[PDB]
């Protein structure tokens, strides 16, 4: 976790080393109860001692809530008054053990400790490798979510005096010994106040600090980046709250009659951005309103304004990575699209609304059989279509979203496959006749569904709604499943694997898809960033030319994997963090020897140990079938599908090794070069080499216009 005794107050992660750990665990051996109770014992195991110490240090706040005291010469006891700083106190020496410990850093280790105990109290999976066998601390943009480059062409002492809005006098120098410590502390406080709710944790980096100096000089002498001090520049790192990232208002204190002290603080701090608004519900509050934009987020805009306002007029703020990524997301042909954020789903909701209207006009039509159900199952309906649904945009390959039409049960169906499908088409004909005769604003035509092998009669009704959308309708009965199992029975052993594969494809299109849609939508509304992450990942795959042989659902599940399994990392709240976590996971993944178990669950019904062991048995059985994995590369499974081969089947091992190779190339590039526009553009570049032949085709018409991008 990147923690040692290095000086945290100087603007880097730390302030907590193994010495500090040993001191505190000795203190827990000494005592530590709220009744001054001894907590651990001299004859425990390392596992017991470690669990107990983690439990205590995670549960007990030591900065704002309480403090811990003891005598080094006796019983330790926690006292429920905080000293606004991490305070373990020997009363024989009056020493705070954690004076090098920034409160923000304390919060960060508190979150890590909570994750540690959560992994430990998990009893099902192997948590050891997440606990100890990965260094999270290497990559900044993976460990944190939003880091911004902060340029300070400071200069010398008088340049500081005229450029730094903060005063540097004797009281600043006596409570913060060094200028750098003062600067980091001030920047921390100003960013914390100016952001507040929108974030989770903050960290500051003095890029360019060193600890080594010869015996030749009085001190460390630098000239780095305009300043002559022990940094090149500042980097701010943010762990950001997901659902608070796009709040167009920033509320302050309530408008009282006089000027309240906190409102005075807010208005002095904000000033030009301070305002009084009258809302809808009879409220009067101080706020600093913003504007939302696609390419750059509100955090970026506010962090520029606040730091420029309250630090220096020469400071510079950047994150070209996040701005580039947001530009790599496609943009709709909807009004005010650039102003529309990335966490706004209005196009999807418009689609769903016109579906509801259609749901009325079909569900109450007159029919042979009473309608049992209508089920959207579509990619857009689970918010994973790459291009957003634009009205009248029929250049989208996924324009016609899919909706099951299930009738009731009745045993007068034919028991023959072709006649069965032809009767289903007769149902769709009656629906189309009635819909045309009553609903003249709609339009309709029929099409041949050829996604399923060896099953040729399937016709689906495409209906066009005058909101500019298109739904394709297919029918489902129970005779489908019964007949397909009958066919696998009356197959011969030469043909049985082919009928099995066809049955799997039918299952994927007609039975698992509804559970797939239900689960992913219900979880995406909690994990807001999952939908942009998976759209970005789809863009990445389409750049790397793998979407032809990778279906949607494999991509979706491997995309949600880092969200549902953050540990040891965090839940991604920024597009760069999620995207790179997915690629990192692919690179680490060894599908020849790794299973994949997905618990599509809201944060903390989950999988029982029996189900986990059953899927693990299935995994071992398929590995015994083919340890080479030549006929089965990925084993991705969940409660909605323990068989797993349903989505992961039907792929070439060349395609899998190409994807693994591209993952490894991306990870090596990030390990080597660094995050900048050239590396991002190089990722989005294709290979176009390494083949046997390349054939390059140009359509008569450029379909961006009718695609609406």
């Amino acid at each position: 976790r990147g923690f040692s005794s290095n000086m945290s107050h100087s603007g880097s992660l730390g302030g907590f080393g193994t010495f500090e750990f040993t001191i505190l665990m000795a203190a827990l051996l000494n005592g530590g109860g709220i009744n001054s109770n001894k907590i651990l014992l001299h004859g425990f195991s390392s596992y017991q001692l470690f669990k107990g110490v983690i439990k205590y240090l995670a549960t007990m706040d030591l900065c704002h809530d309480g403090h811990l005291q003891f005598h080094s010469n006796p019983a330790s006891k926690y006292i429920d008054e905080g000293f606004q700083t991490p305070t373990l106190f020997d009363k024989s020496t009056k020493v705070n053990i954690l004076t090098k410990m920034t409160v923000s850093s304390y919060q960060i280790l508190k979150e890590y400790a909570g994750e540690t105990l959560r992994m430990l109290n998990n009893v099902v999976q192997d948590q050891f490798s997440n606990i100890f066998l990965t260094n999270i601390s290497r990559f900044d943009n993976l460990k944190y979510d939003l880091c911004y480059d902060v340029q300070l062409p400071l200069g010398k002492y008088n340049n500081l005096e005229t450029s730094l809005a903060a005063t540097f006098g004797s009281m600043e120098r006596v409570k913060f010994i060094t200028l750098e410590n003062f600067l980091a502390h001030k920047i921390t406080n100003v960013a914390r106040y100016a952001l507040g709710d929108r974030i989770k944790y903050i960290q500051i980096e003095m890029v360019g600090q060193k600890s080594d100096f010869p015996i030749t000089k009085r001190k460390v002498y630098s000239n780095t980046g305009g300043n002559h001090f022990n940094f090149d520049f500042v980097r701010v790192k943010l762990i950001v709250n997901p659902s608070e990232c796009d709040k167009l208002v920033t509320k302050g204190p309530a408008h009282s009659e006089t000027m309240s002290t906190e409102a005075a603080v807010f208005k002095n701090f904000w000033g030009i951005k301070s305002s009084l608004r009258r809302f809808k519900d009879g409220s009067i509050t101080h706020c600093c309103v913003w504007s939302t934009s696609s390419s750059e987020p509100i955090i970026s805009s506010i962090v520029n304004f606040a730091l420029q306002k309250h630090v220096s007029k020469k400071a510079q703020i950047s994150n070209e990575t996040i701005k580039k990524f947001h530009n790599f997301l496609p943009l709709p042909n909807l009004p005010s699209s650039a102003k529309t954020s990335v966490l706004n789903l209005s196009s999807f909701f418009n689609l769903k609304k016109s579906f509801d209207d259609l749901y009325k006009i079909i569900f109450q039509m007159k029919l042979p059989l009473s309608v049992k159900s209508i089920l959207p199952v579509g990619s857009a309906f689970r918010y994973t279509s790459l291009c957003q649904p634009v009205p009248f945009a029929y250049s989208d390959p996924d324009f016609f979203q899919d909706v099951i039409l299930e009738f009731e049960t009745s045993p007068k169906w034919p028991d023959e496959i072709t006649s069965l499908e032809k009767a289903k088409t007769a149902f769709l004909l009656k629906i189309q006749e009635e819909l045309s005769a009553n609903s003249s604003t709609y339009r309709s035509f029929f099409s041949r569904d050829e996604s399923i092998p060896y099953n040729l009669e399937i016709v689906t009704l495409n209906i066009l709604t005058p909101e500019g959308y298109g739904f394709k309708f297919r029918v489902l009965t129970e005779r489908d499943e019964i007949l397909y199992l009958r066919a696998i029975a009356n197959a011969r052993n030469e043909l049985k694997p082919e009928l099995e594969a066809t049955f799997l494809k039918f299952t994927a299109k007609y039975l698992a898809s509804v559970r797939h849609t239900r689960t992913l939508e219900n979880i995406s509304h909690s994990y807001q960033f999952y939908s942009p992450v998976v759209r970005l990942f789809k863009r990445w795959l389409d750049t790397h030319l793998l979407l032809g042989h990778i279906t949607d659902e494999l991509a979706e599940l491997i995309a949600i994997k880092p969200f549902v399994d953050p540990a040891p990392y965090f839940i991604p709240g920024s597009l760069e963090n999620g995207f790179l976590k997915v690629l990192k996971f692919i690179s680490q993944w060894n599908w020849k020897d790794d299973p994949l178990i997905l618990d599509l669950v809201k944060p903390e019904e989950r999988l029982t140990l029996a189900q986990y062991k059953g899927i693990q048995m299935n995994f071992t059985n398929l590995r015994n079938s083919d340890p080479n994995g030549t006929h089965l590369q990925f084993f991705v499974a969940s409660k909605n599908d323990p068989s797993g081969i349903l989505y992961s089947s039907g792929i070439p091992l060349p395609i899998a090794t190409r994807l693994t190779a591209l993952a490894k190339v991306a990870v090596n590039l990030l390990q080597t070069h660094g995050l900048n526009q050239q590396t991002i553009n190089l990722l989005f570049t294709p290979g176009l080499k390494d083949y046997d032949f390349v054939v390059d085709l140009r359509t008569p018409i450029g379909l961006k216009s009718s695609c609406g991008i």
Partner: peptide
Amino acid sequence: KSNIFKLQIDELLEQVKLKQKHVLKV
């Protein structure tokens, strides 16, 4: 958790364990 955990930490401590010859050299 206990049994596999002891096995895993045993493997870890064995992998990271230091050399007595180097210790006495220092």
